[PDB]
DNA sequence: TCAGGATGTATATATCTGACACGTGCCTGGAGACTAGGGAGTAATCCCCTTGGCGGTTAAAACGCGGGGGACAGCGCGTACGTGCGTTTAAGCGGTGCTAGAGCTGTCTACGACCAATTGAGCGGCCTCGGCACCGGGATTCTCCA
DNA sequence: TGGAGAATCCCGGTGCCGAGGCCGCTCAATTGGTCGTAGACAGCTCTAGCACCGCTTAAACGCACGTACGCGCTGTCCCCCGCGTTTTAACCGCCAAGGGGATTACTCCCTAGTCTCCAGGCACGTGTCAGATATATACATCCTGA
């Protein structure tokens, strides 16, 4: 079709940002896709500016072919403010209505159904769009934008079925992560995009036809050709150069006395789900209710109760001394509460957006993230790493190492972003000889399944049986790492500049082990099994 | 015709318990009714326990489960102890 | 060989052969295990011994050397667990437990 | 002359020590035969059958009177009244 | 032929005394006679049904015991 | 002055409303937690089907409703309209549960 | 300020709240309720549940299972003279 | 000889053969007569028809056309004999009968 | 595997009684429980009736006596008449 | 408040008396030995469903306050129930007599178990539309302060 | 002393999901024989249930009196209900993992069934002591008066 230049968007209302070459290519791609089919997937990598491309598409089809109809945007609660700010920053010619609030304000906005194009873009979230689906089923929307569209991974989702029966002309999905965590999830995305072509009945065909795991150019090229007119991925390495590079550094740690005691106790003796209790024990014992000496005061006993917390405090002292602002991600909210109490003790300036905080406190927290010279950024992986711009910090530290790698990847990408100036140093804290190591390796194995397809068509367990060193039932505390902590992290002027005892680098390098000493488990569980005329009234 | 009862066994147990105490005939008939009633309770509970699990054999495990279901509190523990002791002594011979 | 009753092997006084026959002839299941009669006879003997212990104590409290239904009633209704076991059972010629309410007494 | 309530307590103690039957044999037997004539004519009764019926009936009535006394005391009374019997039987589930 | 009046007032008083009752209203006697009549009617109906099933013309003690056991009132000391 | 109802009118309205309906009157999660806590005292590491807890809740609510009916009769017997713990104790005594 | 533990002290029997007990009493026809009824009702419910759950767990352990089914509860209730219809 | 079911021979809509199999597999007696399953199936059909007719009347009284557990509960508890038959039975999602005592109503 | 019930027979009886009324699934499960409960009550009563008289056969006489023992009032009389009619019709054919 | 009397009740000794405990003969039911077959233990597989957590809304629970109505204590009265005495009735006990019916025995015979072949009734799976649930609106009802 | 206000009911509209009808298949009910034994029937015995009579005396009955208890009334006060505001956790959508329930195949050992033999237990007879009854006798207890 006809190419769109930057001056067309300049005249048509887009006045904020000067676009980029790949952004302009994406806008033209979106325009031609809108002109010929029903739906697409703008799957650029995180931090490349998908929101700018969608706003440019709105400006285009609102001032070129006069498609003046309503646009619906669905996004998580934490990026609602970002959408609202950028919508009026870049495209102030379109009136945007943030359809949020309690039931009463949403009803008062229900009453504004005068239908005189008083709103061009309606902005809401998943939960609201699922609670008020009936009101949001009576509009002829032209474009439906689902930001962070990897929530539609499961096809039996209520959101999938609810959004499928909408009067949308063009469904646009935004997803930064490599969607292909499993073939069925990618097929669910495709079935949402093109429900007629990709029928839900062909799930078995899609999985069977593409069981290939090697290069296999004969089928890799086939699937690439299949996904040519639907998906559009651009990576920072090939597109967004000249950005400071990120260097992931995984750091190992040991245990503590009571940590080993409870680790072995759960491994031997609610305990219906074992994996959750093991991970809880590795993170911090104090989040068990029965192990606290019930002191209702802060103190210094917190650091020695966990090796992970000890190493974290060492890292935090080093980073604060070196002048580094840091993000902090975790899975369980209890561990975040423990970190918040520790930060309050040590007098660290911290901010906390956690999920189940509120709608507006997140906006205030994001403002303070960058306004004040605040040091610690407390975050939850699922409710903090989904689209917030936190470029002020330059160090991402994971204390969780959750199951699938996409969450951690996108959480890390929250700091490696367009507009970053310093280098980003990703830090992981996984315990040595622990179930955390197995979760990490299982995640790493799951991750390099989508790397294969990208590079080809786009470019005994719960043990971890080295418990012999965990059968010492001591501390195994680290103090030599203090002099090497500058060796792993070479800080220059406000930047981080350019596999031994407790550290390992990540440059697409692998790690493996074969769980040597299960004899400890067997022996200590054998120890575990080692641990007439009745006339009840008379004896 | 001959009619059977538990009189001689009740008397043997009584001589074990109280070596110099007797018992009248009305009390003996009451104890016979008691033994029959408890037998029927336990046997019926074991029968329906075996039917619930689609089995066709009444074993000592089902008798033990019926004893735990019927007898209250501290009576069940001692009864289970005596039953287990008797079966262990019986199978060793 | 020399015969020897199953009760002697089990060390019991209640009959194991008779309990086995009653279990077989009561239409309780298609088959009856070998250890079911022994367990059941042991349980019945233990319960009989408990009742007789308490009833003999009650008879000795009244300076009697023979057990009558009144003594069985006192034994059963004074013990809590035997009272739960026999809560819906009537003992003939047993009477009741002496008990007057606190408000009916003069004061 | 004794004050009202003393002979009652002596009777309570006396009849709670004893175990004999408190209803006369012949009137009860006649009542049983009269009731049975409404189900089948020209029946016969073993003596032990009537004895068992009398024992069961007296145990039932004594238990009902215990419940009635509890219900009467509940209402700050010492006299049992028909409404107490009705309440006891309804709570037991017989009404 | 009014054999329910053979359950005399002194007999009902003795039953109440064994039940622990200290003072009795004057309307208790007719209520107790009605209650006893109902109880006896139920038990005797069941016993006569058992007797008729066995094609007998004599109500035995075991019929009464089975009727009482069926109504949830086990009776000890009359055989079985 | 605002509108107020006399004491006892909303009580009768609630009586009619709740005797007309059939839904469960206890919250699901607290009851399930209580059931699991009680069951921990018999065998550790037990699992429950959802229909097992549903059956337990139905039985418990029916039991409590019947007990409250008997309690109300016992309270009316004493010329009261307020039910008190002694009425519950009397009802359970007459039932044969103490 | 002790934000890491300030919620877990509710004693699950207290999850049977006063409004729930009032709703049960209303369905039972009760017009006015004393203030000491709630603890008495909680104790009664706890006793009833202990009996039924003990029987159900016994039935479950006999079958050598680790999951308490609805049939175990139905058998435990029929065991106590309380037949329940509608759960198989 | 074309097979004719025993239910049709008796004139019933309940399965005589299934009832016979259930009688033989329940350990109720050693052997089972020929007319026992027919008589039992007739009784079961009668009781089913009674409750269904009462519950249908109850459902129609509510301007509905499908029987739900509430209608079964109303039918059972409003009948004087079905209530005695099902006195110790709880019907799930059944509710109670609407009944307020007279002393609680206003003067 | 499969699971047998009384649903189709209950439905046929319902369409005899109320030709235009339907039934939900919870009500059908309640009716199935009712039929099973009544079946086991009558069968157990007939079983112990046969045991009392030293018989080994459960006949229609035992079922009739069990119905008369278990059902109250008019329910027993009508049930007996229906069962007798069914047996008489089955025997002549 | 204590003294004392009349009543009732526990206590000690003597004397029957009949029921319990023991010994005997025998017979039938339990024990020993053997064989055959099927019920149940056991290993392996699979996939359903159970548990634990987070995220976010929102309805219910909790807290506090004000007042009125119900619980409870106290008082008076009058009636109905307990107590005691003299009269009457019928229950209890014994003894005799008669026979109806329960109980046991022996002899068939018809009926129910068992088995093999066969086919239709019932069960699982799959649409699909109408009954019911939610919803907004108007109208009548019932309560409460005049 | 009627009107204001909150609650509930009747009416209309929509939509949605679960009850109902169809369909294919498979396994369980039916049919047809054959056997063996449970039960029906006839007969004989003997016991125990019913009926009656006569006498004794214990218990029921009727009556009178007086007292204490049930019941109605009144007054106080405090506690439970109704209602408004805040806050909390129930509930539902969603994501993970993995344990355990459910099925199948195999085999082996445990129980039923039969025959033989013999000792435990049951019916029967017999003596003697535990307990019931009687009579004196002391002691506790209730009640009234000074
Ligand atoms: N042309 C541009 N120039 C500068 N910054 C841009 C441009 N386009 C997008 N961005 C940055 O992208 C951020 C938001 O875009 P976002 O959708 O988060 O990118 P991504 O999709 O890569 O995560 C904003 O902070 C904005 O500064
Ligand atoms: F993918 Be952008 F951070 F919304």
Author numbering:
A (entry chain K): 28 to 296, 310 to 499, 516 to 554, 567 to 599, 610 to 617
B (entry chain D), I (entry chain H): 29 to 121
C (entry chain C), H (entry chain G): 12 to 118
D (entry chain E): 40 to 134
E (entry chain F): 23 to 102
F (entry chain A): 37 to 134
G (entry chain L): 14 to 101
Quote the study on this structure.
ALC1, also known as CHD1L (chromodomain helicase/ATPase DNA-binding protein 1-like), is an ATP-dependent chromatin remodeler that relaxes chromatin and plays an important role in the poly(ADP-ribose) polymerase 1 (PARP1)-mediated DNA repair pathway. ALC1 contains two RecA-like ATPase domains (lobe 1 and lobe 2) and a C-terminal macro domain. Chromatin remodeler ALC1 (amplification in liver cancer 1) is crucial for repairing damaged DNA. It is autoinhibited and activated by nucleosomal epitopes. Here we report the crystal structure of human ALC1 and the cryoEM structure bound to the nucleosome.
To gain insights into ALC1 activation by the nucleosome, we determined the cryoEM structure of the R857Q mutant bound to the nucleosome in the presence of a stable ATP analog, ADP-BeFx. The structure of the ALC1-nucleosome complex was determined at an overall resolution of 2.8 Å, with local resolutions of 2. In the activated state, the macro domain dislodged from lobe 2 and its structure could not be resolved, suggesting that the macro domain did not bind stably to the nucleosome or the ATPase motor domains. The competition of the H4 tails with the inhibitory macro domain for binding to the same surface of lobe 2 explains the requirement for this nucleosomal epitope for ALC1 activation. Likewise, motif IV underwent a loop-to-helix conformational change, with the side chain of Arg402 binding to the phosphate backbone of nucleosomal DNA, as typically observed in the activated state of chromatin remodelers. Therefore, the release of the macro domain frees the H4-binding surface and motif IV to interact with the nucleosome, providing the mechanism of ALC1 activation. Notably, we found that a segment of the linker region (residues 610–617) adjacent to lobe 2 binds to the H2A-H2B acidic patch of the nucleosome. In particular, two arginine residues, Arg611 and Arg614, play critical roles. Arg611 interacts with Gln44 of H2B and Glu56 of H2A, whereas Arg614 forms a network of H-bonds with Glu61, Asp90, and Glu92 of H2A. Whereas the WT peptide bound to the H2A-H2B dimer with a disassociation constant Kd ~ 3.7 μM, the R611E and R614E mutation reduced the affinity over 10-fold, with Kds ~41 μM and 113 μM, respectively, supporting that both arginine residues are important for the anchor of ALC1 to the acidic patch of the nucleosome.
